[PDB]
């Protein structure tokens, strides 16, 4: 259909909380090949955050039940088979996002802000794959997440001020990758602490359009820091 008609149905789907419809319309917008506006970019990220977020949330519940039913064969086996059903949905969702990122979003990103946004997004959805990966393929999935974050990180440090919300949000999620995926609390804390401290050393650089997002993300960075130090 028309791009603008796809976008307004995605906005309709969002307010109806029909995030499958929302992702379907933003996936169609992306496949038309043109660079997404900042508004279209946010709509695609919100839609898939919610479609994958439902599976991640259900995965953690079922995985925790699987962990707490050791000694109860029937219940553990049902939880394990259900977890595997949920894992397949989760993997299909992130392969869908990661193929949009590699075919359209990253190669057509003309600005540094957009490159950092999508490289972080690429780091995010490989991290979601790493959350549920096991065996041989986990090492490669973890490396793909780390290298996506690492490239976004280098671009962000060279092109963005420390108070930029996209740079801060990337530092937040990269910090989480180190803690939860790489099981490295020092590196996680040191990344979150440096991002917080570098932002607070140049609060003059805060825009009024961004200051509330930037100050919230700073608070979230220090929340993880204080929880990872306890």
């Amino acid at each position: 259909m028309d791009k603008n008609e796809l976008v307004q149905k995605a906005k309709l789907a969002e307010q109806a909380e029909r995030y499958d419809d929302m992702a379907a319309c933003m996936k169609s917008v992306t496949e038309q090949g043109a660079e997404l506006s900042n508004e279209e970019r946010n709509l695609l990220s919100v839609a898939y955050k919610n479609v994958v977020g439902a599976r991640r949330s259900s995965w953690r519940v079922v995985s925790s039940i699987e962990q707490k039913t050791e000694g109860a064969e029937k219940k553990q086996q049902m939880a394990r088979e259900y977890r595997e059903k949920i894992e397949t949905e989760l993997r299909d969702i992130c392969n869908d996002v990661l193929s949009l990122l590699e075919k359209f979003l990253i190669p057509n990103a003309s600005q540094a802000e957009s490159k950092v946004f999508y490289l972080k997004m690429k780091g995010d959805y490989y991290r979601y794959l790493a959350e549920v990966a096991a065996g041989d393929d986990k090492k490669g999935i973890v490396d793909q997440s780390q290298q996506a974050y690492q490239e976004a990180f280098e671009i962000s440090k060279k092109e963005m001020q420390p108070t930029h919300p996209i740079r801060l949000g990337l530092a937040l999620n990269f910090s989480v990758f180190y803690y939860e995926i790489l099981n490295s609390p020092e590196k996680a804390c040191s990344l979150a602490k440096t991002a917080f401290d570098e932002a607070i050393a140049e609060l003059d650089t805060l825009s009024e359009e961004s200051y509330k997002d930037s100050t919230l993300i700073m608070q979230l960075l220090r929340d993880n820091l204080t929880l990872w130090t306890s």
Partner: peptide
Amino acid sequence: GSLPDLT
């Protein structure tokens, strides 16, 4: 806590 939606 990873980045939440702020849109």
